[PDB]
Amino acid sequence: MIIVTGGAGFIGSNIVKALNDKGITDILVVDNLKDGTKFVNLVDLNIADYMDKEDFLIQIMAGEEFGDVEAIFHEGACSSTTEWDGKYMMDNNYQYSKELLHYCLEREIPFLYASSAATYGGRTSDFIESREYEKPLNVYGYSKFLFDEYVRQILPEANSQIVGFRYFNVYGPREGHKGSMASVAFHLNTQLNNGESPKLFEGSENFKRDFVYVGDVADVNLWFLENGVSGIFNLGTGRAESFQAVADATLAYHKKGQIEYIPFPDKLKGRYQAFTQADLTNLRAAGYDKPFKTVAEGVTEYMAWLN
Amino acid sequence: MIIVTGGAGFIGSNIVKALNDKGITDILVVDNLKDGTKFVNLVDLNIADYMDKEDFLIQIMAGEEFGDVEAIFHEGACSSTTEWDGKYMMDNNYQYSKELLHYCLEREIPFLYASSAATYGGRTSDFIESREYEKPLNVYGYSKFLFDEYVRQILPEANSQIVGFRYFNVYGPREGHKGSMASVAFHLNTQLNFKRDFVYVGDVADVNLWFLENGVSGIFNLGTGRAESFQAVADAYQAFTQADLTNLRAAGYDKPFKTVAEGVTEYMAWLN
């Protein structure tokens, strides 16, 4: 079987779907279903079992076996860039990850986890997977940063696969539960569908990010499992587009819409990345030979799905 | 002895009553009496013992023996479609049932549990017990659906009886504690004081004991096979439901089900 933590979440459920598409249905999903609405991410999919993240951690630490485990896609984490409880952050993200990494290392089970482009911090170019280029602006980013550092210590003598993917701005199907953390594209679609005005922060024409479609994120994940390469790789399209571009593509699909500019949130001031662009040199060097959908291509496919 | 989980609840207490009618009183009721008003479902009945759902799970997991257990009717669950705490939902419903299932499998104790027509979701026809017809609209429905999928993985090599009943719109005596989740017929009665497959609890209890006596395994729809309107109930989200009884009849259960008109008048003649 394959274990997908964060399996009821955005990226996790898309990995489960990609596995289903490849004829794999022996899957254990580990998540936190407190917010029961997340179940829709799993309804049309096929899995073998479900376990809560707290029970799973207890069993992992107790050395329990879950069967013939072929890989663990660790997507589970608190992903809110605006969550400031650092005790919880380091516990749920950092410590939880180390616990799983060791469990897999002992049993030589491939470990593929989720890192974040938030690790780069206030950068304007050179988004390269190296400590000198890393300086997070929030605890969330720090929890991700510190685990990558921990993995870099472990890599030299690991006897099984360990891969971390620094996702950039992921968007696409199955993120409806994310609320305020859902992608801007999702937000714009609900605003337009509720008759409200589509909104963007003041400064969005100069605010650029590397938006990647989830479908591509799932594909990179499965490719790495099939190919066994280890390391920490940036996962983005390699091209930064403005938030305005995301809006343009979405408002084109809707045939209506006039963007309203909202004042920049105070809680984000000093904690925000105004520009991100993945450097795919290492990803390509690892052998990943597939293309990435553009914002225009990915956003129109997503909007068709949302409606 | 026979263990009935959810025994102080609607369907469970009706199963205890049906057992009492067949001269069986050596029954262990497992439930959650936080809402003490449910004790009335049990007052006029005869059971051997009562245990809280949390204590029972601790003992089940500890591998404790409860005596000469002849069967477990697992009716206990959070049956609210409006309950959105999925952590609790998956634990109380899904995980709890797996724990019980394994306990019974190891000891070859017949396991008869409660599924739900909510597994079908927004469906308009073809309510057949197969994964392609299932797509719940809420976590409650999901916890039920996922356990059915788990049982389907277990069925091929099980050495003892496993039966799940997909109840449709059950109504009848002993549901007063359900509040907003009580049947529309109950609501109308207390108020005065879309088509669904409405089934009388009496028939539900009968199907349960019939399967225990016949030992057949599987997942079966439990409804009348006839969809009637809420208006019909009054005269006496899934928008339309109607059980496909092909598998139930094929298992050998050929007995008829009371209509809304027959069941609702017998029910009012009880509530009053």
Add this chain to the structure above:
Amino acid sequence: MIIVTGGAGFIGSNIVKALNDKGITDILVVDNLKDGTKFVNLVDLNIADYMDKEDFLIQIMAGEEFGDVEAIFHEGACSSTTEWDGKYMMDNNYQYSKELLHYCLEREIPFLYASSAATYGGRTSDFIESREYEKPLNVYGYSKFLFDEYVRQILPEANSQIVGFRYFNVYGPREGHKGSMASVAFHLNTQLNNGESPKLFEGSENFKRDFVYVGDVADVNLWFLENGVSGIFNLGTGRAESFQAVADATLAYHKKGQIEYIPFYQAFTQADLTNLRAAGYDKPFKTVAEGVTEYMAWLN
């Protein structure tokens, strides 16, 4: 040593008093003193030790020994007919009693507990100790009923004493902490002393109950311990008297007052003592007039 659970409570402290009255002082009282005012039921008494109901259960369940235990009078329970948390009710009353029962059975220690006439629910007549006559109206009544059914299954092969007493409307010393649940005699006394009108519900004549004096309740308990008989027995006088008769006896001692009848339920209870007498207990029971005058003397 004798263990009295509910010992800081109404009936339990009266059992401690009765034991003291014969010179017995080696007593372990188990209760819940969260409501500290209950300490008065114990100040004038003589006991060996005190333990909270939670710690006691933990020790019982762990199989600890408490010394030379000659009996356990289990009076401890939640007695509120208005308490609807059935999870607590079934745990504190039903489950706790089973735990104690088993502990005593394993060690052959006499077990005398408290049942309740609430098991009869809305019964009007024929208050006999048999399942056909039982149908409680609330969870409290149900927790008591079910434990009696459990004891009935255990009785046939028990090797030591098991006795349950279905108390009716008990009244007498040490029920002051019960508030609105205290006896009408207690309420009337408070009123007369506060200078208010002794109050009775409209048409209180014709409203009858089997009012029993706690002193007689305590005596039945000690008699059964001394005689070793097992079973479930009604504990009442066998005579139903009206609330009016209780008021009459109250003013007859107080030498004052004029009853005021307030506005607006069992209109009748009377214990059938056939089984109690058949078990061997034959002492008389104080009448309302006798018991109430004695009670008032203590209250004042």
Add this chain to the structure above:
Amino acid sequence: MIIVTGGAGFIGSNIVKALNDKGITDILVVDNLKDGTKFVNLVDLNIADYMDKEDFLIQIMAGEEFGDVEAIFHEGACSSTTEWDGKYMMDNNYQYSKELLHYCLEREIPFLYASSAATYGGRTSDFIESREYEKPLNVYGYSKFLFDEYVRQILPEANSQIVGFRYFNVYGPREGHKGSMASVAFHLNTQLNNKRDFVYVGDVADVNLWFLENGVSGIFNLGTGRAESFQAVADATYQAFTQADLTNLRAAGYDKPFKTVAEGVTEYMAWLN
């Protein structure tokens, strides 16, 4: 070392001070410092260590050793007469004390604890250390009473010292943290700055050390033996009437005199400045 429970409190800190005055500083103070202001009662004193009352009980019950313990002055307790949670009261006072008593009995460590005149309830005369004179008016008094009864059962066959002191109305230094529960003399002093048996703490501390040095066991009233009015306390700056009967105290051998209200209060007013 000497263990003083209630050591950051009124009477306890005074016992620590008395020990300091005799060259003893190897002291373990056990208290509850939730009210951090109680630290002042110990700033100017010399102790060896501090431990929270909860941790101490856990170690006592686990049978841990604390070093070479020569005595335990158990002053720690909830002393609020207006505190009605009897579950807490019986646990914190009654049960806690039994736990300590047994620990000391098994190791033959002298056990000197605090009782209370509240055990006499609303009494008017004959304050004598015997059960017939005791009838507390609140759970506080009851938790104290019942532990004295427990000690009386234990006394006949104890192989080490057990002493309980029935303190009457104590007043003096280190009670500032007590708030409304502080002595009337303390209250009057605060205000100006903006019949019962009153005993000075200094005397209370002295009696405590005397018994440890002399090893006598028993339960003894600790008061001056004379009842003075609150008016008297005022001039110098529910139990109605209290007056300790010192027959048993003198009989045990403690002959020393007690400061009167006028003497004790003027000395106290002096320290409070």
Add this chain to the structure above:
Amino acid sequence: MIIVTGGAGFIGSNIVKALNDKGITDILVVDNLKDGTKFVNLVDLNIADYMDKEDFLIQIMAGEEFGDVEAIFHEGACSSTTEWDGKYMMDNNYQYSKELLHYCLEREIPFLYASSAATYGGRTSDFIESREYEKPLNVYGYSKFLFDEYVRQILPEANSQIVGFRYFNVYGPREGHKGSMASVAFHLNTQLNNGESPKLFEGSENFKRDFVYVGDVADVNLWFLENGVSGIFNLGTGRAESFQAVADATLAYHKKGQIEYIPFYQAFTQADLTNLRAAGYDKPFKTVAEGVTEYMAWLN
């Protein structure tokens, strides 16, 4: 491996930085990150691992091994002078410290901890490291004082290094999380940057403290680790400067600003460095002018 408790805090993160500057990156930081904004004190540094203070205590007390531990810099504590829950203070500060001291003593791991000048209380002169000079004014000062007294009992027969540093008025990079508890220099800088007025208490011209730069605090810490000397030492510059001088240096840097003396302890502090120099620590300490200007260049 070196363990730095309080590592995400002010002094602790500066010690981690000083370790990094000397090539040491194998560091375990133990802290409480509930206030997640403290992460910034660590983003630019290099450590080996992070652990919460509660989990660390459980492991310490369980006797767990953390690897090859060559020293523990115990800077973690509740540093609020206005915190009055003494149960917590004594637990988190005093007890937690004893727990760590014993763990280190058993394994002979050098233990360097943080004391406080608050142990002197309201003292005006003679800030010497001896009991006669100590008399704290709050529980925080008392928890620090009592641990120093405990260490003094332990010192005579210790077989490994134990050093405590009584820090005076520390100021410098990485204290932004402290809020109201941060240094006046920090405060003045945030105000000059909020376009508004720098506030100083009226009479600041005569409010003097031994202000010490964190950089020098970290240097003392590493020097003692390198030299293995034990004891309790004052950590200040030995010179008392006014709050006005602090302000002068700030405004000199900002090339602007006008001081508004707002309405409104320890009006004088000055470390006696006799024992510090006698231990062998001979380096000079930055003055307020030197330290404050360097601090401004960093804050901007």
